[PDB]
Design a binder for these strands. Structure first.
Ligand SMILES: [Mg+2]
Ligand SMILES: [Mg+2]
Lengths: 110, 96, 98, 154, 80, 126
RNA sequence: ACCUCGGGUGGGCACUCUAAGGAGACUGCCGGUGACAAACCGGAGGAAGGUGGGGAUGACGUCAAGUCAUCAUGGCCCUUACGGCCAGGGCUACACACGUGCUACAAUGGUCGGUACAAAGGGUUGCCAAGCCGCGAGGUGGAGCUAAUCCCAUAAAACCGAUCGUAGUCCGGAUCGCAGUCUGCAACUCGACUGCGUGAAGUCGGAAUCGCUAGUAAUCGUGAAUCAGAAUGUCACGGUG
């Protein structure tokens, strides 16, 4: 609603744009370069004018409310085909080819 | 002139076999100059079936040695090369 | 084994037999100025050769013993035949040091 | 245990002209980061000169001698009963006990701007309300309950 | 992986046992031990008997299977 | 003449130190002394044998040092200039033998041994 | 002297360095101490002082310790296969438990912009520069080179300025989606790196328990062997201390 989500205050611009969930850190360094907003000032000190140009960039990359939708179909395409990358992805095993006998605990919990 | 061998009880004992046997024939040959030495360490395991922390490490050396003529007018050392090579000395010629 | 040295002897023949066409077939593909029609038929000549011609199929074993692991290429010996042949003064220029 | 241990000496402080401060600087250094720890000790030295008009060496000279203790226990077990014996602290040892207590309570001060943590420690011990002074006097109180074991099965 | 300079990969004996086997259409499964090759839009809808390791398993080729190789659709290890 | 050659080695460093009469000319590798050693206490440690022998103002100093570490080169100069000061006489010999400046520090690094991980640290067992 | 200001050049053999051959250290000398006898405690000189520091060198033997799968051999069995040949698979599976090892948990820090100093080693079946095109890994390009010459090859921490205000964070980086390059006939099970995105557990860790007496612990990098490709391990060399 503010830029797609709420944006914190009393912070620099590149840090503030990070919470938009679809722009990391290197991408938000291009947006202040392409628009011209100084990151060295806070978001409080800005004008209420050029935020549309920041909002123009949000309408060109992705939005987290639909980013998580479309990335699920990338998962969902892998599951319903029954390919090996979606075979373990149904179950909960690691995917990229890690070791399974021990230590793969961030995909199985405590 | 440059010389390569494996032990200093040959290669630094064959320069006098060249310095004396060339300065005798008139031409001036200056004092030989040492070079840095090749050193290669080989750590090998020693037990047939395994016990890792028992090891043994060797080293193979290579001594270098460079001569320097002043006036080339002697083919005397060109015939006396089979004399100056004895067992393990290799001589590449740089007749300066 | 002895039957296992013998099957990896003839791999060294078949690599060193052909050895020149596969340089040419990899000279064609590696050029950015090469045409893909000249590349695609060059792909045909690689896979129809017997696969025991690449160097990656070749395995440098010990020459006197045959043991795969523990091989050095500044010698031709194994890990444990090199020790027995060096203590008998054979290998020239090789001593212990610190 | 043949007696072996000789003495090695470190005494160098050119930018201030001191000797106790150099030995104190070694108790602040972690993993050989000397140039980092050098500007923090001077960084907590000038804040005292900012705070007090006196030369801050003498603040440090006073803050040692209200953290440095006099007697302490020594659990020498008789071999069948665990005893503790209050012993006189050797005069050479009693410098390093204060300087080691001082740094370890600076790290749990919990402020911002790290040289301000050590700044507040050297201000308190010229008065006595520091946690190092409260840790000093509590171990002093442990000796008199232990004072019955001073010579007898000691 | 398999960078775009060297674009496609398919096996030679597989190709003549498919491209000629398109001209007489799908009345048989293709029994093949090869697993290193991709599938291609010249092959949408066929029936392949990919080698498990100890048997062949049938494959129903669809249109949205195109980039992935045959190895993702034969099993290796059971874990019942 | 009055040119005096001084060498000194500490922690795999080596410093050519030349010493001749002048007025405070302290130059090292065509750099000033405050510029070369950036922000350390060893900016004064190179002066410590000099100001002990009360000759801080009476000589030109030309230093060329190679190899070593940052604060290892500063020790090479301090050992190096003490050999250059004692080319004069042995009047300042006793002023430096007592000072502990003339002896070269022999403490060099130690090699990794097999079984161990560092020079003396070894892995944990149970 | 020269210079275009680069030992660039002429030159020099002072030096550093390199490596050959030597001297030096023996309780030698001074005092005290002991049976004044081995020795011991102090002292001078000296680069070094009491086996200067390190390394290789492990007695008679022990545990029928380990290895017939490195190799060698007594015997025993197979010899239409317990031997050979070729494809795919496998050893990298996976509620769990134990062993070593790496990062972290932040402000003695985190980023950005400048800037300073190493040793040791590999390279004519190789190193693969300059220029050059790529967000980046790289692609072209082909020099120089058989090595104190050429390349690997930019040491990092430290220092200087800036922001960051101690917040599960401009902390941390696991997972995962997408897009790429390199080797190899071939990256599905099963390789390494690069881009972009997402961002977890973790706020110093019980009972217990191990390493180390000085260029040592602690911390920061670099190289080699094996090797088409692939190191948090092994071996090896230095910084700060
Ligand atoms: Mg004892
Ligand atoms: Mg490799």
């Amino acid at each position: 609603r503010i830029a797609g989500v709420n944006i914190p205050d009393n912070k620099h611009t590149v840090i503030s744009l990070t919470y938009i969930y679809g722009v990391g850190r290197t991408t938000a360094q291009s947006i202040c370069a392409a628009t011209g907003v100084n990151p060295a000032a806070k978001i409080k000190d800005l004008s209420d004018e050029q935020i549309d140009q920041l909002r123009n960039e949000v309408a060109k990359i992705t939005t987290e409310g639909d980013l998580r939708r479309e990335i699920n179909m990338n998962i969902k395409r892998l599951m319903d085909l029954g390919c090996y990358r979606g075979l373990r992805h149904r179950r909960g095993l690691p995917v990229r080819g890690q070791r399974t006998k021990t230590n793969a605990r961030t995909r199985k919990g405590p | 002139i440059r010389l390569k061998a494996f032990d200093h009880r040959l290669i630094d004992q064959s320069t006098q076999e060249i310095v004396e046997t060339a300065k005798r024939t008139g031409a001036q040959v200056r004092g030989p100059i040492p070079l840095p030495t090749r050193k290669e360490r080989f750590t090998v395991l020693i037990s047939p079936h395994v016990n890792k922390d028992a090891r043994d490490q060797y080293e193979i050396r290579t001594h270098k040695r460079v001569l320097d003529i002043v006036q080339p007018t002697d083919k005397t050392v060109d015939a006396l090369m089979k004399l100056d090579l004895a067992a393990g000395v290799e001589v590449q010629i740089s007749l300066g | 084994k002895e039957s296992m040295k013998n099957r990896e002897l003839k791999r060294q023949l078949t690599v060193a037999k052909y050895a020149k066409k596969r340089a040419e077939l990899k000279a064609i593909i590696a050029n950015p100025n090469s045409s893909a029609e000249e590349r695609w038929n060059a792909q045909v000549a690689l896979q129809k050769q017997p696969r025991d011609a690449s160097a990656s199929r070749l395995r440098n074993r010990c020459r006197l013993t045959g043991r795969p692991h523990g091989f050095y290429r500044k010698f031709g010996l194994s890990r444990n035949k090199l020790r027995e042949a060096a203590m008998r003064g054979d290998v020239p220029g090789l001593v212990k040091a610190s | 245990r043949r007696r072996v241990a000789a003495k090695r000496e470190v005494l160098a402080d050119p930018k201030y002209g001191s000797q106790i401060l150099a030995k104190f600087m070694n108790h602040v250094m972690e993993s050989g980061k000397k140039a980092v720890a050098e500007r923090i000790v001077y960084g907590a030295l000038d804040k005292v000169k900012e705070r007090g008009k006196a030369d801050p060496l003498e603040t440090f000279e006073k803050a040692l001698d209200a953290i440095a203790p006099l007697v302490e226990v020594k659990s020498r077990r008789v071999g069948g009963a665990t005893y503790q014996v209050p012993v006189e602290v050797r005069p050479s040892r009693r410098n390093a006990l204060a300087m080691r207590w001082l740094v370890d309570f600076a790290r749990k001060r919990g402020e911002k701007s790290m040289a301000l943590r050590l700044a507040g420690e050297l201000l308190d011990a010229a008065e006595g309300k520091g946690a190092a002074v409260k840790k000093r006097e509590d171990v002093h109180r442990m000796a008199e309950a232990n004072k019955a074991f001073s010579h007898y099965r000691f | 992986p398999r960078s775009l300079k060297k674009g496609p990969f398919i096996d030679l004996h597989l190709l003549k046992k498919v491209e000629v086997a398109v001209e007489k259409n799908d009345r048989k499964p293709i029994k093949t031990w090869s697993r290193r090759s991709m599938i291609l839009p010249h092959m949408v809808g066929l029936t392949i008997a990919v080698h498990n390791g100890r048997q062949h398993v049938p494959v129903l080729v669809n249109e949205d299977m195109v980039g992935h190789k045959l190895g993702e659709f034969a099993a290796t290890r059971t874990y019942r | 003449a009055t040119q005096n050659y001084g060498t000194g080695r500490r922690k795999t460093a080596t410093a050519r130190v030349f010493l001749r009469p002048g007025t405070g000319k302290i130059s090292i590798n065509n750099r000033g002394l405050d510029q070369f050693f950036g922000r350390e206490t060893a900016r004064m440690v190179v002066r410590q044998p000099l100001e002990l022998t009360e000759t801080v103002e009476k000589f030109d100093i030309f230093v060329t040092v190679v190899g070593g570490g940052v604060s290892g080169q500063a020790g090479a100069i301090r050992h190096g200039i003490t050999r250059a000061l004692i080319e004069y006489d042995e009047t300042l010999r006793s002023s430096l033998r007592k000072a502990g400046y003339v002896t070269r520090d022999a403490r060099e690094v130690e090699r990794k041994k097999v079984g161990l991980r560092k020079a003396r640290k070894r892995p944990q067992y149970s």
